[PDB]
């Protein structure tokens, strides 16, 4: 029988994972009324993530989804921007896109990353120092990656708040025409930005993406919009909630917080354990089969939705001992917070860099930081990205 996964799962997924993962390495479940296959064990997850039988095909997903809702033309630029990126395609097309996007990074762009992150972190902490209590998400965890990614991409400072707010609104849309409307505005904005960098190339990643070439091959206008969008959003709320979840873990384990403050040689290991323990993404993006596939000994039929639970794999006792415990001194190497295989997260070094600097700088500036509320007052967002509604902290 197909276990129904609802709002309780969304808010608190790891106890569901602990019960299904013991039963089999893959579970047949129903998520949002859609039957699908949930890969749970670490080995099975690595195999699924390297299995060419799992396809990124948003068009087939749409067609299959229409069938489960029993319902059955020109795509708007928003519609296209949402799905015409790296995570929306398979090789060879995926190989080409990611070859070109990797060329766009210049050495100057990469080197400015660390100085820029420490300057933004600095500015943000100067703006909250003196307040007794702040919501660390709105005051720090969300603005930092918004700024860093926006500056790397080339979004002007005066436009950054608005792009962030549109991203939040895209994230909470419930109806396709609404989502498409938000996306259409975003795509229109990114079309203007791209036009201005064609006319006057700067030292930003948009200009790098326009100029990248493989002989005469280049990113089309469509691919540019979709990739600039994905690069802006893929690390915005994901980095913020990594920082949020990690700071929450650190505050709920004050001995390790103090240990980390006293010994920065534990910082790298602390960021790794944050990704393993409570990653902002416990699920990867939806995949669809075209033919039967074999994952963890479980046969999955053709025309099936397949989702890989990075979180369940990261909490797999076959791979990590005492996996429900947060322990920065652990060997957390080999987690799947950034994926695995051809779609492995392109931004993983940047996400690690921002998180390491942000947490380090927080504990340096605010030695007496603590939760400002009782844990029973915290709430998780009703969202596939694992994140808190707020993180109230007393800076002291």
């Amino acid at each position: 029988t197909p276990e129904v996964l609802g709002e309780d799962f969304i808010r608190d997924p790891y106890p569901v994972y602990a019960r299904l993962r013991e039963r089999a390495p893959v579970a047949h479940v129903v998520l949002g009324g859609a039957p699908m296959w949930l890969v749970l064990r670490h080995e099975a997850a690595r195999a699924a993530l390297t299995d060419p039988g799992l396809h990124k095909d948003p068009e087939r997903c749409a067609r299959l989804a229409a069938r489960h809702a029993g319902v059955d033309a020109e795509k708007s630029p928003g519609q296209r921007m949402l799905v015409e990126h790296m995570l929306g395609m398979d090789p060879p097309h995926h190989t080409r896109l990611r070859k070109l996007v990797a060329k766009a990074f210049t050495a100057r762009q990469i080197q400015a990353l660390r100085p820029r992150i420490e300057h933004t972190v600095g500015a943000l902490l100067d703006g909250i120092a003196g307040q007794g209590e702040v919501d660390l998400l709105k005051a720090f965890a969300f603005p930092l990656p918004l700024t860093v990614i926006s500056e790397m991409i080339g979004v002007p400072q005066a436009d950054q708040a608005a792009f962030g707010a549109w991203s939040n609104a895209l994230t909470v849309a419930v109806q396709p025409q609404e989502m498409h409307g938000i996306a259409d505005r975003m795509a229109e904005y990114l079309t203007g930005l791209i036009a201005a960098k064609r006319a006057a190339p700067d030292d930003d990643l948009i200009s790098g993406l326009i100029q990248a070439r493989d002989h005469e091959d280049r990113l089309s206008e469509n691919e540019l919009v979709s990739m600039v969008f994905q690069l802006l959003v893929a690390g915005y709320e994901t980095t913020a909630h990594l920082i949020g979840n990690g700071m929450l873990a650190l505050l709920r384990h004050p001995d390790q917080l103090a240990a980390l403050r006293a010994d920065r040689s534990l910082l790298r290991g602390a960021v790794e354990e944050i990704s393993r323990y409570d990653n902002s993404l416990h699920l990867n993006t939806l995949s669809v089969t075209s033919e039967p596939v074999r994952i963890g000994g479980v046969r999955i039929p053709a025309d099936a939705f397949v989702i890989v639970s990075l979180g369940a794999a990261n909490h797999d006792p076959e791979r990590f001992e005492d996996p429900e415990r947060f322990d920065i001194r652990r060997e957390a190497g080999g987690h799947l917070a950034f994926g695995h295989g051809i779609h492995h997260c392109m931004g993983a070094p940047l996400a690690r860099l921002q998180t390491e600097i942000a947490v380090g700088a927080l504990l340096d500036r605010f030695p007496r930081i603590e939760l400002a509320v009782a844990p029973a007052e915290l709430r998780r967002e009703m969202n596939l990205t694992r994140g808190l509604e707020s993180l109230p902290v007393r800076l002291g």
Partner: peptide
């Protein structure tokens, strides 16, 4: 959202 469906997640 980034496989073309409302409900966040891209």
């Amino acid at each position: 959202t980034x496989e073309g469906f409302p409900x966040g997640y891209x």
